[PDB]
Amino acid sequence: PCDTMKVGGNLDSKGYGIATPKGSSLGTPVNLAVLKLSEQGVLDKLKNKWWYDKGECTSALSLSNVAGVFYILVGGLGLAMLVALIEF
Amino acid sequence: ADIAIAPLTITLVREEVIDFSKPFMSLGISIMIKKGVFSFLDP
């Protein structure tokens, strides 16, 4: 529902990191896999798909900032025409 | 278990006991808080 907001900036800078137990056979290859994905740009594609794809959330003045005065003007022109025709 | 493909955050203490990889996404701590026509008369 977009009922909240982020304020200010980041207190500390860090990164999420895959983990493995000491001496794992997976540790050496996962590093190379991460670097290859980073170079290819895959991580950015996943980020865009799961973050931006879920998105549900001087300068001159614009007709919007003054439209009210235009509404009053036209309404007045109308009231005037009505008064005149009534008198006629 | 044998691996953690998770949103796990790197830190000095956890490295002393387990081996991390190169970060796959960067981040930082942050703070989360709760979020006229006749306007020409406002002045």
Binding site: - | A1, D2, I3, A4, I5, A6, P7
Partner: peptide, 30 residues
């Protein structure tokens, strides 16, 4: 060879599929 993968449901990193009752194996997580 098979990897024991640990995770938590911290969206959007890990979250169950809709109607995952009919999903079997790792497919129940998206």
């Amino acid at each position: 060879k098979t990897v024991v993968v640990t995770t938590i449901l911290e969206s959007p990193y890990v979250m169950m599929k809709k109607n995952h009752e009919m999903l079997e194996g790792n497919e129940r997580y998206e």
